[PDB]
Each structure stands twice: as C-alpha cells, then as structure tokens.
C-alpha cells in the first residue's frame, strides 16, 4: 500500500499469558499515546501530543474485551497452535555524538520481539541501573512482531561502561549488548 | 518457557495528498497470522487464511458490521486527521550536524523530524560519491531520527571537507567543515 502517511488508530494487543493487553495509537511509526489499562487512563509518553486531542480510555477497555473474546475463539479455530518464540535483535547506540562531560542518552533497540513479553534493563559497570531509564510501548511492525526501545540518560566518562540486558523466551540466557565510549 | 497465544487487531489509516485520498484497513491477526482483512478499497471483509472464511462470510452478511467498517474511513481516518494528524504534521525539528573522524569521516545528522533528509559530502567544493556510504534512516523512538553518512578519504594538508544537509525544517542548507589538521 502506497501512502504519504500511515496511522494506527488501534493497535490492539491481547495475549493469553497473564493475561495481558496493550492499546496504543501510532502515527508514521511513532507512539502518540497508550492507555494504562490498569489505571483506566490515557497516557502520553511525550506529553507534547496531549495538545493534539484527547482519548476516552473506555474505548480501549471495550476493544480489550473484544480481543479477549476473539482470542479464545481463534485459539480453537487454530487447533491451539501456540506462539512461536522469535529471537530478538538488540542494538545499542547513542542519541547524539558522544563528548565526555556532555550529557547524552543511550538507546537500546530490541527488535523482532515475539511474543511481546520482554525484560530490558541497564547495567553500568556490571551493576543494575535504576535512574534515568525509560521505555516505549511495544511498537508494531508490518510482520506483526514488535520492537521496544529503552533509554538511559547518562554522563559519558572513562569511569563507566554500560550494557543493555535483555531477557526473552527466544533467548537461551540473557543477552547483554555492550556499549562504551 | 510458557505457552502463549497472541491476538492483534490493527486499524490502519493510509493518507495521500492531504486527505484527497484516504484508505483504511483493519487486520485481525492470530499470533503472526492475519486471518481476516477489511480494506476500504475492497469494500467487504476478505478471508486471508482458511480460518478467516466463516468470519468474513458472516460479517459480510450483517449490514450493521459492513456499514460500520465502510464508515471507518470518515469516522476514524478523516476525523483523526483533522483532530490530530494535521497538527502532528506541522512538527519540525532541525537536524544537528557533526563531523567526526573514525581514514574515514563520519557526518552525524541527529535529532531531526520529519524523516526527509538530504546529505551530501564535498571535497574542495567538488562532490564526493565513490567513497560515501550511509546508514538507513534510524528511528530513535522519541519522534526524532538520525542518519550517519561516512566518507572514505585520504587527507592532504589544505583540503577542506564539507557535509551538506537539507531538510524541510531548514530555509537554507546546513554546511559543516572539517579541515586536515
């Protein structure tokens, strides 16, 4: 399909494991907002877009009930064929050119995720980092797998080398993708 | 490693030349497999796999469902374009342009939006092409892109290299210089 722009106004995701669901809108491949199904709240990962319209979170809850219902039907019609675990692909790169003493952001891209269940954490000098970490939702792909991106704001220096740690059922053991200045 | 079963319902809006041309497609997906599709260019549900046949058959028989799907293009795609997408399409973030030697020169063009970008390398006002390699566009996930365009070179004293960048957020091209030191 040839178009100038593409929106997903309803990426609706629901899986048996949990069970668990996700509702997001995407425009030209970036996330506009998600719905926190727990809190019943529309949330914008980049609050700038909250100026571009509102969304009633109830619409997502409604689609999630349909999803639950349709998934059970489809499990039967597909002879209970379970999801094949894919091997995720991990890349770590920085947001801008890296200068020591100049605050930057590391970016961990976890691509080819299926099913959408993953643990992504950061390690500085082999130790788990907590602060300065954030994360996208599971973003959709035209082959119906997902990617997820995690961020680490960091001050580059000689003292710190970092890893991105990724856990997924398609991996035998945790995958560590290393990055250093 | 737990079993899992995944359901995805995607509502997609494709836009060309403003809203002169609008196409909507919905996809019902079991695990990675699209089983039934509505495509506004087609006008009815279409089974994509055998498991989608009774689904498409039923919905095509129900005028309420069929008319709901057919109305989607105006009630969802065009509606959302006026409420949100027209606004999002006005977003412009200028690229940062940075030259760094890796003999290879790396021109980093970072933090720009939208994705349309032109980058050229010059040596002494003569354009280089034979020794140039670029990455694909890189999605940061935070509504910015970056791209790297490398130049194979052999620096003589006196040579001037320039990275030349055009982008819709720029009235005139950014040029950055690198001199053999």
């Amino acid at each position: 399909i040839v178009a100038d722009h593409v929106a997903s106004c309803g990426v609706n995701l629901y899986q048996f494991y949990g069970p668990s669901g996700q509702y997001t809108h995407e425009f030209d491949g970036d996330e506009q907002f998600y719905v926190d199904l727990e809190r019943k709240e529309t949330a914008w990962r980049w609050p700038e877009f909250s100026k571009f319209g509102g969304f009633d979170p109830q619409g997502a809850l409604r689609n999630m009930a349909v999803a639950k219902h349709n998934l059970n039907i489809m499990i039967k019609r597909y002879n209970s064929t379970a999801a094949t675990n894919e091997v995720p692909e991990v890349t770590v790169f920085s947001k801008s050119p890296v200068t020591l003493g100049q605050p930057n952001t590391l970016i961990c891209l976890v691509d080819n995720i299926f099913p959408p269940v993953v643990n992504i954490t950061w390690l500085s000098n082999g130790q788990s980092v907590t602060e300065g970490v954030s994360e996208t939702s599971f973003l959709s792909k035209s082959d119906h797998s997902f990617f997820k991106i995690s961020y680490l704001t960091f001050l580059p220096s000689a003292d710190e080398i970092y890893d991105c740690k990724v856990e997924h059922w398609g991996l035998d053991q945790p995958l560590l993708k290393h990055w250093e200045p | 490693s737990p079993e899992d079963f995944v359901y995805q319902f995607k509502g997609l809006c494709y836009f060309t030349n403003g809203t002169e041309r609008v196409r909507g497609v919905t996809r019902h997906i079991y695990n990675r497999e699209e089983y039934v599709r509505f495509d506004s260019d087609v006008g009815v549900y279409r089974a994509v796999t055998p498991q989608g046949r009774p689904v498409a058959e039923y919905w095509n028989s129900q005028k309420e469902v069929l008319e709901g799907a057919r109305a989607s293009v105006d009630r969802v795609c065009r509606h959302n374009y006026e409420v949100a997408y027209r606004g999002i399409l006005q977003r412009r973030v200028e690229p940062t342009v940075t030259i760094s030697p890796s003999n290879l020169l790396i021109c980093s063009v970072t933090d720009f939006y939208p994705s349309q970008i032109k980058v050229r390398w010059f040596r002494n006002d003569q354009e280089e092409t034979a020794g140039v390699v670029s990455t694909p566009l890189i999605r940061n996930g935070d509504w910015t892109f970056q791209i790297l365009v490398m130049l194979e070179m052999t620096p003589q004293r006196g040579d001037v290299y320039t990275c030349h960048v055009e982008h819709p957020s720029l009235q005139s091209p950014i040029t950055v210089e690198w001199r053999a030191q």
Partner: T-cell receptor
Amino acid sequence: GGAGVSQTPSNKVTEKGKYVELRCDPISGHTALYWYRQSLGQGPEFLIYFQGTGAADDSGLPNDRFFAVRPEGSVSTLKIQRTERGDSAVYLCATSALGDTQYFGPGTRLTVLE
Amino acid sequence: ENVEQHPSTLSVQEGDSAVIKCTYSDSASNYFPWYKQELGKRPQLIIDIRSNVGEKKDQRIAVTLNKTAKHFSLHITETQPEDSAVYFCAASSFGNEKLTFGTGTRLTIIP
C-alpha cells in the same frame, strides 16, 4: 437468543441473606449485553457491559456481592449474594448489535423482604 | 456525567402537543436515544438522534438537538391516549457506549 430480549421471571420475591440469579436472553447475534438497574420513579442506571464473553466495563456494580457472567457470549446471568433490602429494584437487560443502539428486555423486579 | 430531564410529570389533553427537554454534561456525547416505558414493562426505544443532525421526525414524534447548548428535546404531536407512559432521554459517546439516562417524565394523556 430470539427476536426480542427476554427476561423471566417478571418478578422475584426473596428475603434478606439469600442468593439470587437473574437471567437474560439476548436478541440473536447481538454482541453487546448490558445490565441496568431501575429504582422506583427513576431512570435506569448502568451496572455492567459485556462485549461477547468479555466484560467491557463493570464500573457500575454496586459492590462485591454483585457479579455477572456471559459464558458463551449470548445468555447472561447476574448473581447477587446475600441479598439486602436495598437491592430491591427492577433489573433490566439490554442488548445491542455492536454496542451503541440498545434494546431493553421487559425487566425482572427483585423484591427483597425482611 | 449526568443527564437532566424536565418535567418529572406532565398532563396534556388528548390532541395537544407534549414536549420534554433534556440537558447533558459531556460535550463528547454523540448519540441520544429516547425510551418509552409502560407500567410493568421495558423501556422501548422509540427514536434517536446523533450529533451530526439537528432534527429528526418520525410520524407523531420529533427530536431536536443543540450540541452547543447541550440541549435536546422530544416533541409528541397530537397526543393519543396510548402515549401515556414514562419517557426517558439518554446519552452516550464514541468511546463510551454505556447510556446515561435522565430521571424520567411521567406523561399522562387526558382522554
């Protein structure tokens, strides 16, 4: 289901502390099913909304003695545990082809006595 | 989010018009059905109107909608005795399909 929304019986009388089940039979093929509650001289108030077998919205359930099911995306049953006098009202079932346009059944009046 | 309905009771001579007015609180409301309820029975859907339309008529009954004022009304012309019932207005929105009802109007047609 049938051509209209059915609820039987029209009336149920019971005493405090007993268990009660109210049954709704939807219009054939209707994906959406709602329970509303109507007290004397008032309008219907929302209790719970099913899409197929799934609960879309249960925000109206008064407390945890109230629970409903729709195990096969057709017939729904509203269950009330340990009934109190304040639960007395007319319980109305409504179903919708897709969700928006709602057709009501004739209701079941629950009378909980001392 | 509530719907406000007036009057709570109304008597009108057979053959005269009957008018019921409602106001709603949520500007996102886009669907507005009206129900007629006979004693011992179910609210019966008699007419509805959507936010893209200001008026709709069906036989003896009419509904009007003013999105700006968030007012909507039901008119019953040349009332007949079988119009005696309790009438409810209601409202819902694109994202929230649950109906919220007014408090009702007991209409008595004097034969």
